[PDB]
UniProtKB/Swiss-Prot annotation:
Keywords: Coiled coil, DNA damage, DNA replication, DNA-binding, Metal-binding, Nucleus, Zinc, Zinc-finger. It comes from Xenopus laevis (African clawed frog). The keyword NAD does not apply. Each zinc finger-like domain binds a zinc ion and is involved in both ssDNA and dsDNA binding, as is the OB-fold domain. Residues 147-172 are annotated as: Zinc finger-like 1. Its main location: nucleus. The chain holds residues 235 to 407 of 860 of the full protein. This is Protein MCM10 homolog. Residues 1-146 are annotated as: OB-fold domain.
Length: 173
């Protein structure tokens, strides 16, 4: 719950991974910030990377299918650094079975995920993983927060914020 984690730049309540063991897993890999994913997939040169990325589970969807099996879930991720950039992580079969009860607000490491086929109508980056071990639970995002201001009207502002970097959102300074 105090000072920052080297790789994600977030401070984590009750960390789950040795400092050493992080450098170990991180070794020889490329750190790609979540915001850089869209372009690397578009320019079609993400595959050739042995890459790692970091997100906070901002939201969990556990929608409908049972199509032939078979339940799955979706996580909305944000790095609390580019508060505008989000990606969606699809968990299927093994991976769902294994991680789907993870608490929202958990910071995760995501390694060498697979881009989903792009769906008409979206601006959206979606990825899945062929293996439970591609998702590294690192602990709680102690700074996941909301703009402290009030919507110049009534109601409190609802904009997402990094409580350790800034307490107000972009639109209130
Ligand atoms: Zn605000």
């Amino acid at each position: 719950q105090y000072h920052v984690e080297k790789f994600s730049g977030l401070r984590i309540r009750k960390p789950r991974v040795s400092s050493s063991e992080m450098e170990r897993k991180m070794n020889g890999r490329k750190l790609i910030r979540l915001a850089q994913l869209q372009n690397k997939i578009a320019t079609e040169k993400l595959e050739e990377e042995d890459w790692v990325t970091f997100g906070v589970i901002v939201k969990k969807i556990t929608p409908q299918s049972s199509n032939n099996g078979k339940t799955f879930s979706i996580w909305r991720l944000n790095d609390l650094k580019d508060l505008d950039k989000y990606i969606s992580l699809f968990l299927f079969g093994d991976v769902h079975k294994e991680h789907w009860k993870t608490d929202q607000g958990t910071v995760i490491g995501l390694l060498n995920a697979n881009p989903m086929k792009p769906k008409e109508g979206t601006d959206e980056v979606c990825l899945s993983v062929d293996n439970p071990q591609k998702v590294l639970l690192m602990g709680d995002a102690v700074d996941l927060g909301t703009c402290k201001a009030r919507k110049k009207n009534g109601d409190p502002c609802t904009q997402m914020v990094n409580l350790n970097d800034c307490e107000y959102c972009q639109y209130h300074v």
